[PDB]
Design a protein around this ligand. Structure first.
Ligand SMILES: CCCCCCCCCCCCCCCCCC(=O)OC[C@H](COP(=O)([O-])OCC[N+](C)(C)C)OC(=O)CCCCCCCCCCCCCCCCC
Ligand code: SF4
Ligand code: SF4
Ligand code: SF4
Lengths: 154, 206, 114, 176, 112, 386, 76
């Protein structure tokens, strides 16, 4: 029982982190470096992170750019339509905490006011390599999960 | 001199002569004509002259300002007519630019220039949205940049930089909500102006 | 005091445009509640409409009334055309904002604001 | 000077007509495109084996911030607040007072890394090379709060990365 | 004859000289209804008469174009059409009249 | 009926989110209503609380594919109000990196234009080239994108030794890369079926709707601000302006591909004609002195201190300054009140007028032709929304 | 059916909550007597519009300040 649950989490954690299908909100600048992560030099697809997905087939949402008050409701709705398990990666200063528009009347001061965030990737923009480091950091975070061990001990 | 921007005397004479030309032809509306030291010609007109002046500059054979490069507004609260409406036009035929300026206040409508330049359609929506200046006879005047339901005109000098409300998602009502703005760190106002005059050539009289 | 008008040339002309706006807003509330699936009642929505018109009752400047009507019509269009999302329509009700103390003693206890 | 990108008149002699008919019926211009993607399949890809391989950077790279020291170990920063003044994002917050030895030093030095635009203006404004953007770019965190650096974090970044920061400065200070 | 003006939506003209003569004559006719002292009439009449004289003397379309310095002859025809439209509008506007109103004292002062 | 085009494609794309409210009858588009503002961040109001140096990085983040070109426009506007002149080597560097930036933009414009239509392979081939040009940005500035390199007065730093040879190496092979792109698209009957006679705009309508750049030149209008109203050293380089004949998406696509070839032609001249000397105006009341001077000279330290706190004061006045940005005419109406912070800064984004013409250009087209038409205008909502 | 007009008109006003029926007499003035407000009258005119299936422009709607006037307008 205890042994099986440990190896079973190992399996599903391996599957979910080895097949991370992202939905990217290309909101602004940071989406350019996001495209460079899909470009041949880094080739995010080689890690199992597919190129195109669809909101309803996605595992991770990458908020790549500034989130304005006008866009906030639409971003929350996409997050609400994602099937679980779902993760959010906050990419760049704007999505992290408002960044260079932090004091603007029309900017959400961090996307973590709208959705829960798993990883914060600093930079303006973070380099494509910095984003890839954050994506591989999220895989390690998933590798640490213990859904069945916790469930079995309820 | 290597560090000093050179002067162009021929364009200053040319733009001055054309400025008198426009003043002589449109005396009903033209209030002032001036050319800057970097050779930009500005026509200051009564707001009633927006359509006649812009039509003349677009269609007249010696003007041919076919392209509306930009249309914006400047807020100067100390003026009775706080809003300055600025038209920047381009003439491809004569390889020249002209700036036409007028004015209005919070309650006085300006005539839509969409009939002269279709380009003006969105510019006027942006001026309405961001300064609250109404344009009469506009096909579809509504906000263009701000959020739906946004109150106030953010580019006015007396609108606070961070606004009055801010957004967050609230779990109790399961939607994004708007609340009065609170800042964990207030924006730090800086007084940067030196107490010594920099440019005597612009000194105002005592 | 001779000024260019917006639409109305006097307050009686302006009051007419105000009443048409109220009719349009009054009739749209039942549809608004349904299309956006609001959880307020139609009576609640109409009470808010009355509240918003009420707090501008003191105006005696026809130009200011025209702008108030102009702004009110734009808001109606955003609602009629479903440009507003559910969040936008519900911002008139401030459901998540706790009541603000109004009397002297209540404000004295909480802080320094008057 | 100008040129026409699409002002060619097709030749209507039967030979040229038949050439265009063969292209339509036999898809020759579509076959040609298949050759180009085929030629790429047999090319060496441009992918690098991250994290075992890394993208090339230069000494000027603007990465994570750090506070620097003199060789004696004394802090370079003298609380002049020029970096705080120039910061385009108002991301720096500084407080200072006389140190117990009378030295002009900071008591607070914070950089909100979620406000910062990583523009490097602070390290240009600094008169003593105290604040720099280091070469580290792999410092993403799991919480927002971990990106609000205080003076202890920034001093530790300086002690952590000084070996490389000093070399990068040595390689670029003659361009500054 | 050309094959194209080079400008999308602008068609070649088979009879440019005759079309120009009509348009400049129509402009001068419309300019007759503007007060004699209006600067618009005096200036518009002067440039129109200069262009019309050039059209009279030069029969070759290419050679006429270098004289007018107005681009393709179809562009020159289009401009004459706009001038004719403008002249009609100026009759309603009457911009030759005295300034409608002075601006407030410091309307055009900068810096404040 | 009534539709709403999605915010963005399912594949990763960097140009912003659009809310396009569409009227259709059958397959035909009856009306397009672009609802923008989803990336409006109040840049122009923020600039009013910044000194002239502090506002420069805001311009990298407008058309955030043409970073240094946006910087150059702002720098030219400020240099014009200051009445100073950047040094000749800085001007050559600014034209050199202006054309490198034009390559960056046109690769993004053309390959994402194909990627949205479904031709996705050229995107991957050409962003390996963009990756190498990001390395040029990072080597002069330390940043791959938002360099803040071009500044009023010149450029921040001088080219590192060995950079020009590497730029030559890249430029040597680039024309072949354009050739491979054309092999996939230029004569492809499917690509032509998606682009030819799509979004036709007449020369007169283009001017009155406020278009610029390729949107004008695709309709045969012979206008390029680098030729007619040259800035920096553009009057010392030789290049041809591509002109279209049919005013449609296909002619504008060819113009962008030819403009890429001319950019390589211009870059070749900048590499060969780069002169020696200083990189920022030798005028320590505008451009900060060298760090070695700041640490030895009393005057230099004072000027360093004041330039990095108060900033330099700009004489009162207003200018409209525009350049031939990769996306069309990019201008700034900059108002100075005599202090060290701008009083007003209106940004003229070429895509603002272009997206206002989408309704016109899409009349009587299919729902999928709207995809191609927003593609051919090359819209970045960072510059449209500010 | 004129006499029915009175019933429908007077019936609709009964359903309106702001008018206490003890004071609802066919000749009662909405403002002076019943103490309604201008916008309350607009709500009544809209209520009559649904009952009788036709519109009432503001020009005529502002002249109907008691039930009898409504009856006169509808029949005419
Ligand atoms: C039914 C058939 C399922 C077979 C299980 C497949 C597991 C494959 C695997 O774990 O690869 C080795 C993996 C590879 O290690 P890795 O995925 O953590 O990292 C490899 C090294 N990097 C990331 C740097 C490239 O080993 C493990 O991590 C342990 C996971 C065990 C899960 C298997 C449970 C049974
Ligand atoms: S974090 Fe920087 S690069 Fe990313 S969207 Fe914001 S300003 Fe642009
Ligand atoms: S890099 Fe720029 S934004 Fe970041 S702390 Fe330094 S000056 Fe401020
Ligand atoms: S880091 Fe440098 S610029 Fe900032 S306060 Fe310290 S000494 Fe001054």
């Amino acid at each position: 029982g205890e042994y099986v649950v440990a190896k079973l989490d190992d399996l599903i954690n391996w599957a979910r982190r080895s097949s991370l299908w992202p939905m990217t909100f290309g909101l602004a600048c940071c989406a350019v470096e996001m495209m460079h992560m899909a470009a041949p030099r880094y080739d995010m697809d080689r890690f199992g992170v597919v190129f195109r997905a669809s909101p309803r087939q996605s595992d991770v949402m990458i908020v790549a750019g500034t989130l304005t008050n006008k866009m906030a409701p639409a971003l929350r709705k996409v997050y609400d339509q994602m099937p679980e398990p779902r993760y959010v990666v906050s990419m760049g200063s704007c999505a992290n905490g408002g960044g260079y528009y932090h004091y603007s009347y029309s900017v959400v001061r961090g996307c973590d006011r709208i959705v829960p965030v798993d990883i914060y990737v600093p930079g303006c923009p973070p380099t494509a390599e910095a984003l890839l480091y954050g994506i591989l950091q999220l895989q390690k975070k998933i590798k640490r999960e213990k859904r069945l061990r916790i469930w079995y001990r309820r | 001199r290597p560090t000093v921007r050179p002067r162009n005397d021929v364009a200053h004479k040319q733009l001055s002569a054309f400025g008198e030309y426009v003043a002589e032809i449109l005396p009903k509306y033209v209030q002032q004509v001036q050319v800057s030291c970097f050779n930009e010609l500005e026509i200051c007109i009564h707001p009633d002259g927006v359509i006649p002046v812009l039509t003349f500059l677009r269609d007249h054979s010696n003007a041919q300002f076919k392209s509306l490069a930009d249309l914006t507004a400047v807020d100067i609260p100390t003026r009775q007519n706080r809003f300055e409406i600025v038209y920047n036009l381009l003439s491809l035929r004569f390889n020249s630019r002209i700036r036409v300026k007028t004015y209005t206040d919070e309650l006085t409508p300006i005539e839509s220039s969409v009939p002269v330049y279709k380009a003006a359609n969105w510019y006027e929506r942006e001026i309405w949205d961001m300064f609250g200046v109404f344009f009469a006879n506009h096909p579809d005047l509504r906000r263009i940049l701000t959020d739906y339901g946004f109150e106030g005109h953010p580019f006015r000098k007396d609108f606070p930089l961070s606004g009055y409300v801010e957004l967050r998602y609230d779990d109790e009502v399961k939607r994004v909500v708007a609340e009065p703005v609170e800042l964990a760190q207030e924006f730090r106002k800086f007084d940067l102006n030196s107490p010594w005059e920099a440019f005597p050539a612009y000194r105002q009289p005592p | 005091t001779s000024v260019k008008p917006i639409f109305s040339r006097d307050m009686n002309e302006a009051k007419r445009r105000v009443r048409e706006l109220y009719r349009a807003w009054y009739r749209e509330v039942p549809n608004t509640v349904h299309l956006f699936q609001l959880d307020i009642s139609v009576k609640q929505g109409r009470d808010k409409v009355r509240e918003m018109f009420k707090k501008n009752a003191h105006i005696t400047d026809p130009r200011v009334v025209d702008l108030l009507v102009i702004k009110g019509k734009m808001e109606l269009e955003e609602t009629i055309k479903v440009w507003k999302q559910r969040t936008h329509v519900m911002r008139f009700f401030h459901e998540t904002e706790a009541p603000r103390p109004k009397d002297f003693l209540s404000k004295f206890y909480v802080g320094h604001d008057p | 000077t100008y040129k026409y990108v699409n002002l060619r008149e097709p030749s209507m002699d039967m030979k040229s007509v038949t050439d265009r008919a063969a292209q339509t019926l036999l898809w020759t211009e579509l076959i040609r495109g298949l050759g180009m993607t085929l030629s790429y399949l047999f090319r060496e890809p441009a992918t690098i084996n991250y994290p075992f391989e890394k993208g090339p950077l230069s000494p000027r790279f603007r990465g994570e911030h750090a506070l620097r020291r003199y060789p004696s170990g004394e802090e370079r920063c003298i609380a002049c607040k020029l970096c705080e003044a120039v910061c385009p994002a108002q991301a720096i917050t500084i407080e200072a007072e006389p140190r117990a030895d009378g030295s002009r030093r900071t008591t607070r030095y914070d950089i909100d890394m979620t406000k910062c635009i990583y523009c490097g203006f602070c390290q240009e404004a600094c008169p003593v090379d105290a604040i720099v953007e280091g070469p580290n770019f792999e410092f993403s965190t799991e919480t927002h709060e971990e990106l609000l650096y205080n003076k202890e974090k920034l001093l530790n970044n300086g002690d952590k990365w000084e070996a490389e920061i000093a070399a990068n400065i040595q390689a670029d200070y003659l361009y500054r | 004859l050309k094959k194209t003006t080079g400008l999308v939506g602008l068609a070649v003209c088979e009879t440019p000289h005759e079309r120009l003569k009509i348009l400049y004559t129509k402009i001068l006719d419309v300019l007759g209804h503007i007060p004699k002292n209006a600067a618009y009439r005096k200036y518009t009449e002067q440039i129109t008469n200069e262009k019309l004289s050039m059209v009279k003397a030069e029969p070759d379309v290419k050679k006429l174009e270098e004289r007018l310095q107005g681009g393709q002859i179809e562009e020159v025809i289009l401009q004459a059409e706009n001038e004719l439209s403008l002249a009609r509008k100026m009759i309603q506007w009457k911009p030759w009249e005295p300034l409608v109103e002075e601006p407030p004292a410091s309307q055009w002062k900068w810096p404040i | 009926s009534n539709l709403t085009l999605n915010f963005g494609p399912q594949h990763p794309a960097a140009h912003g989110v659009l809310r396009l409210v569409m009227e259709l009858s059958g397959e035909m588009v009856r009306k397009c209503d672009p609802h923008i503002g989803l990336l409006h961040r109040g840049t122009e109001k923020l600039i009013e609380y910044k000194t002239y140096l502090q506002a420069l990085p805001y311009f990298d983040r407008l058309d955030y594919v043409s970073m240094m070109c946006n910087e150059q426009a702002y720098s030219l506007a400020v240099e014009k109000l200051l009445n100073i002149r950047p040094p000749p080597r800085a001007q050559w560097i600014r034209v050199l990196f202006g054309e490198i930036t034009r390559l960056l933009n046109h690769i993004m414009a053309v390959t994402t234009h194909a990627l949205d239509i479904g031709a996705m392979t050229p995107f991957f081939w050409m962003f390996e080239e963009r990756e190498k040009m990001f390395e040029f940005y990072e080597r002069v500035s330390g940043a791959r994108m938002h360099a803040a390199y071009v500044r009023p007065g010149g450029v921040h730093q001088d080219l590192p030794l060995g950079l020009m040879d590497d730029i030559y190496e890249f430029s040597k092979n680039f024309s072949l890369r354009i050739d491979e792109l054309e092999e996939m698209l230029t004569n492809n009957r499917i690509w032509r079926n998606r682009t030819v006679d799509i979004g036709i705009v007449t020369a007169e309508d283009a001017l009155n709707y406020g278009f610029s750049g390729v949107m004008l030149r695709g309709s045969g209008i012979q206008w390029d601000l680098r030729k007619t109203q040259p800035y920096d050293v553009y009057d010392q380089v030789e290049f041809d302006v591509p002109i279209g004949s049919r005013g449609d998406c296909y002619d504008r696509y060819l113009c962008r591909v030819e403009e890429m070839r001319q950019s390589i032609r211009i870059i070749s001249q900048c590499l060969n004609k780069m002169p020696p000397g200083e990189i920022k105006v030798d005028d320590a009341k505008v451009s900060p002195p060298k760090r070695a001077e700041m640490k030895t000279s009393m005057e230099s330290l004072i000027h360093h201190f004041k330039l990095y706190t108060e900033g330099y004061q700009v004489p009162p006045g207003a200018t409209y300054t525009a350049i031939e940005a990769p996306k069309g005419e990019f201008g700034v109406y900059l108002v100075s009140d005599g202090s060290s912070r701008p009083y007003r800064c209106k940004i003229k984004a070429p895509g603002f007028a272009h997206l206002a013409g989408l309704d016109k250009m899409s009349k009587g087209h299919m729902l999928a032709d709207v995809v191609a038409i927003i593609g051919t205008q090359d819209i970045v909502f960072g510059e449209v929304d500010r | 059916t004129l006499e029915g007009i009175k019933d429908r008109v007077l019936y609709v006003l009964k359903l309106y909550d702001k008018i206490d029926p003890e004071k609802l007499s066919v000749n009662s003035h909405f403002m002076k007597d019943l103490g309604l407000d201008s916008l309350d009258q607009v709500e009544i005119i809209m209520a009559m519009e649904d009952e009788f299936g036709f519109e009432i422009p503001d020009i005529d709607a502002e002249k109907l300040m008691c039930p009898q006037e409504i009856v006169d307008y509808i029949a005419d």
